[PDB]
Structure formats: structure tokens, C-alpha cells
Amino acid sequence: QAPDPAIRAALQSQPSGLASDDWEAAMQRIMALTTRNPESFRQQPQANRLSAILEAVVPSRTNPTHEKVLAIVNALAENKAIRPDEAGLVYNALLERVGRYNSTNVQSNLDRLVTDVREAVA
Amino acid sequence: QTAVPSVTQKKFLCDRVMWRIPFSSNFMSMGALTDLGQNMLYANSAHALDMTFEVDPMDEPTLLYLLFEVFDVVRVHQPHRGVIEAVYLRTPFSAGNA
Amino acid sequence: PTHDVTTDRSQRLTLRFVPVDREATTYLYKARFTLAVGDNRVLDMASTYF
């Protein structure tokens, strides 16, 4: 079937490993609640043992603007509304328009579109 | 069978190289972030450094070219076309997040 | 690695053992030491040299 744009978008814009989004999985590592291996975190060097603690306690706010728009431009290609090579052009254009006019309403409507377009590819 | 008494002089020449004193517990390189420099990472202390060099009675004025190994890196953001932003960072000799 | 790779107590990297007893001959020459390798530490013999 046609791959889900939202899954594919997260497959090229989100850290492969752990990020602030995976906070619940991060806290299980730093407190040995993982069934796989609880003693992994205890044995890390102090440098990358504290940096993981600080992030988990106070999460870092990020910018989801680029992830949302990448989901849309990935969905447009699967409907062939744009040529695959045009994906670079469209991604940077939409991004600029949203920047030029960002605001809360805009951000929320981009979110509706992301859902709507998944259903549309289906 | 005529040799005169003599004294022995020793010296050495080590050119094309610079001395190094690695800031590690056992002077050994196990990684970029040394163990000793890893202690003061999140502590907000501030040491002071004093060093005394005893070199030689040279005839001409000279300089002591000294290096402090640091971490100078840069992250390069390219959000939009024609937009490039760099974030520099030196941790021991601070240089700002410009 | 931070903790379990190197110690924090006082420790000497290089030791110098003087001969405890020396015997000499016309051609032979014999020396005798006592290695006395500390405690809670391990010496690799491929570092000692007369």
C-alpha cells in the first residue's frame, strides 16, 4: 500500500534514538525500569549520564513546524500532485509562506491538514 | 695510546614536534573528553592556573608559544534556502554562541 | 571512562628499588632486590628494567 506520510515524515525528521518526545522511555532508562537491561544507565560516563538527567527533568521545547510541513509535501508526492524532484522546491516554499505568516491559527490548521491528508492518501 | 682525559657531554634534539602534557589522570588517551576534564563539566567552579617555565639563557628574545587544548565546534543550521546560521562554542576559553 | 578506570588515592607511577645485597667476582656480578609490588595494584613485568 501507499506508505503513511506521517510515519514517513517522522522517519526523516526525528532522532532515531531518543529525543524529548520519548520522555516516558527516557525516564525508564535513567531509573532502571527497563526489562531489557536496567544496569545500562548506571555504567555510563558522568559526562553523558548527567546530560541525560538534565533533559529528562526539564524537557526542551522544540519547533514542530518543519515536521508538519514535511508530512504534507511527502503526501503530495504520493498523490503525484507534484513531481518527485519538485519536492525540494515545494518544501522550502510552503515553509516560507508559513513563516511569513505564522500564528496560532495557522499552526493549528496545518495540523488538521496533516490528518486530513493521511486519510486522503488512503 | 695517547688519549687525554676527557669529560662527557650529553644533549638531544627533538625538532618538528611540540611537547604535550595530556590533562588526564594517567596521561593516557582513552577519549576526547578526558576523565579529569569530565569532572568540572557541570560544576560551575572556576580554577586559576599558574605555570612557571625554566628554559635556558638564550641570546635573542623569544616567545613561549603555548596551546590550551579545547573543544571548538560549530553547528550549521540551514532552515530555508539562502539561510545559513552557525553556532560556535569553545568550552574552556569561552567564545559565545554566535 | 570516568570512575573505574583510574584511581584517586595517592599512587606512584614509577618506583626505584635499590639493591638489597650485592655480590661480586672477578668476572661475575650479582645483584638482588625485593620487588614488593604494593597492594590493590598490579604490575606488568614487561616494564621493569635494570
Binding site: 544496569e39 553523558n48 | 577519549g31 | 571512562p1
Partner: peptide
């Protein structure tokens, strides 16, 4: 699992289980 080995960010550096060793004149 004695991890007192250098890191590579995470996932401690390396080691091949089989490597303790032999050689002779042959």
C-alpha cells in the same frame, strides 16, 4: 559486562570476544 571501556557517544567502544593469543617460530 564490565563497561569501564571508552565510549563512542553511547554503546561502549568495541571488543572481539575472540582475541586473547598465540605465535611461535613456525
Amino acid at each position: 559486562f564490565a563497561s569501564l571501556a571508552p565510549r563512542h557517544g553511547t554503546r561502549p567502544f568495541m571488543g572481539t570476544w575472540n582475541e586473547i593469543g598465540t605465535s611461535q617460530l613456525n
